[PDB]
Amino acid sequence: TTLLNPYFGEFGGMYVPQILMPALNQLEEAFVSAQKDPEFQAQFADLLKNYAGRPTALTKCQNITAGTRTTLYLKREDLLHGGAHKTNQVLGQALLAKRMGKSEIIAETGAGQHGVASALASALLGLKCRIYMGAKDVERQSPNVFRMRLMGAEVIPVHSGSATLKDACNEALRDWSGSYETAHYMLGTAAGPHPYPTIVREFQRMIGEETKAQILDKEGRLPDAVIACVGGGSNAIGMFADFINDTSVGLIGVEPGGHGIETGEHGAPLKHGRVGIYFGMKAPMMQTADGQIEESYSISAGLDFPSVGPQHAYLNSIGRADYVSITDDEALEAFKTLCRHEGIIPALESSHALAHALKMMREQPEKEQLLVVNLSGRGDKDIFTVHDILKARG
């Protein structure tokens, strides 16, 4: 029994060991309660505005669309404190943890971006944050590891198993299985077992709500489409949610195509994987023929995830949202284009969404269309990645 439906059509659910069900049920109830509590809402709003910097700007990019009938706006989550949309929901989850009487946060991170977000909200709200990280990742992520420790989070190197993210997640959940009365597991995307896909969406939906008010103010109508990159699905569902019942508005999710779908080195399970059960949910995933979870790939670490949130699988299945893929090369070109023409250095994750809008524009230059791309983050973090690739390509 749950208060909310754990499924979006056949996708979602709570595929966790029995011992974690009470933690999930407790979280769902605290979240339902929090959503009806004006005080919680006022506190979350105050932090979003006065600490994180919301509302974020909606920037019209005229230079990039010159000569075409496309009008493009970028929702500026790259201007949010921390440099990415992740900040929104970790602040909400940290408030839920406190509502449940918890003073500790458990997270795990690969690239280190969720780790940084978890650590900053925890520093701000007086929570002892411990982040599990595969030893292999700790080694390859010095900058973010340092940021996490500067902010007081305990970064726990995991050497068990293969010493990668799956090993960190494992240890994190085990920890949580024994400490959930005093610790909250802060999941970093709109995936995993219910209630997380729902919570993350609701804690990121201000992206879409603001975009709606801003576009109505500036253009006097809704967008023909909102476009967002999709790793686990949080920034995209955050942008999409408020427009779901506005059926004239297209919702386009962009998965990473990596070196190309045909090469198998990509992170596009929604359109090119197969339904499976893992990470506590039933969802499309990249898997071998006999059911092992495949390794995903993208030039962008933030989109290097082998599955996708269930609500996206569902919106896709009923045809309400369409999902496409963008390769490393297309993302890199979009990255360079935005720097040069708008003076904005976008995250490589976000460059996948921008790349797809650039393609919609360039393929049909005389098509009149009002598009909004969710610029999920800034790309200062990607400067060396891009530099070395370009240097390598002479």
Partner: protein, 255 residues
Amino acid sequence: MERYENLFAQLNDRREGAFVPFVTLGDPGIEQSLKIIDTLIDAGADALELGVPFSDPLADGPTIQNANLRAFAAGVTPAQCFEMLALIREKHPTIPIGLLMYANLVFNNGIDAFYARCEQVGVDSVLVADVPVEESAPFRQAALRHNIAPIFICPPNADDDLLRQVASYGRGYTYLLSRLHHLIEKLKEYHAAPALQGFGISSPEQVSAAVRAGAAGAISGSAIVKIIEKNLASPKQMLAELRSFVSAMKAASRA
């Protein structure tokens, strides 16, 4: 199911508890794993709990995670595991054989087809570690249609509602997480499948305590696997050490 029912009736007639080793199929290799399993049986295992290596075993402890890696290094696949299962049943016709699975390997080619294959090779039960009772309907239905006992974990944080569901839906045995006198009493009150205590059982005194608490037996995994882990270079010593440990744990279960 029949094999578990038969085993527990016999053990009960002997006022004896069951000792059930857990090992990962294929660890450290297919041949060595089959020899390991035959040694556990000869040394006294009443039943077996066998893991099929999965890439993302969210609930496997450190020792078990390392067993999965060794099996993957040997190239073990679910298909090879089923071939090993067939051969193990072909050698031991009465010992209950239970699988410890992760949902995706059961769901992958169709839930019903998975339980059909278990029936075909002679497996008796399946515990899907990441399927709580709330999501168990398709799994337990498929298991029953193929005469496989669906196994549920009764954790320490279980409430009355969970006890009743577990008693009602499970067959073969109830997996009682040690991390209990009360949990055991209610399970019996609700007529649950005999309970086997699992988690951290590594010494003979824990096996006698489990039986004394009212459990029908005990499962030991990490302690067995560590023996494999420490003797990878001396297969002979590995089996000898395994025989000694299992024999000691099994004696602890006798009246």
